[PDB]
Amino acid sequence: SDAPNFVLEDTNGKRIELSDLKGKGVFLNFWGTWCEHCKKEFPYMANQYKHFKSQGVEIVAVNVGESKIAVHNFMKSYGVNFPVVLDTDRQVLDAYDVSPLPTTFLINPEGKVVKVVTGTMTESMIHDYMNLIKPG
């Protein structure tokens, strides 16, 4: 099933479009700075990103509409090294029908959603999930 396309700004100004990431696996994450999951899991994502980025797995972590300053503070506290985008009007959040937070969509290189993860993730789970969507 196809991942609704979108264009948002990363936390540096850079226009990120989802369909431009075709050819790579996308670990797509919707998150808020108040979520217990994300405080635990963000350091794991950062540590697994060190290994997977050069294999063709990209992270897009869509913050659900909070201020740039809350976002920046969270990124700094939790060692974030990956792409964060700011869904400022909440309209990507809607296109994706996101209910619990966080939710992770695992998008393969063709642009299709192969899993929706709504539960807690261990660092091992995250490793496995990135192996599922990598080109190799």
Side-chain angles (χ1 to χ4, degrees):
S1 171
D2 258 288
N5 187 48
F6 64 85
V7 200
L8 285 178
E9 256 182 298
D10 70 350
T11 66
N12 295 326
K14 202 225 137 187
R15 187 204 184 257
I16 300 174
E17 181 161 348
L18 191 60
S19 56
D20 285 359
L21 292 172
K22 252 165 185 91
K24 278 148 171 189
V26 182
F27 182 102
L28 176 70
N29 182 229
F30 290 80
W31 68 280
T33 71
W34 64 80
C35 303
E36 305 316 336
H37 286 219
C38 311
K39 283 150 165 164
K40 290 160 167 166
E41 289 167 25
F42 270 31
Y44 301 162
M45 284 168 49
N47 199 54
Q48 290 304 309
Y49 193 60
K50 291 168 173 77
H51 196 263
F52 273 110
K53 180 187 155 60
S54 68
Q55 340 229 108
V57 176
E58 187 55 288
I59 296 166
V60 178
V62 188
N63 175 274
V64 285
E66 292 170 89
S67 83
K68 320 193 178 211
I69 307 75
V71 169
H72 175 259
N73 291 164
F74 189 98
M75 292 176 64
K76 279 201 130 159
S77 289
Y78 296 93
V80 171
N81 53 5
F82 46 74
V84 168
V85 295
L86 310 151
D87 185 19
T88 67
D89 288 37
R90 297 186 71 101
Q91 349 197 314
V92 185
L93 184 48
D94 269 350
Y96 274 79
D97 205 57
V98 167
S99 196
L101 284 159
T103 317
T104 303
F105 300 73
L106 300 181
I107 299 163
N108 70 10
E110 291 68 73
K112 306 301 173 96
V113 176
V114 307
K115 216 189 218 300
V116 180
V117 177
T118 198
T120 286
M121 285 179 292
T122 58
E123 189 166 14
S124 294
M125 292 167 81
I126 293 155
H127 190 264
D128 294 336
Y129 284 159
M130 292 186 173
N131 272 333
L132 190 51
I133 58 177
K134 82 160 191 258

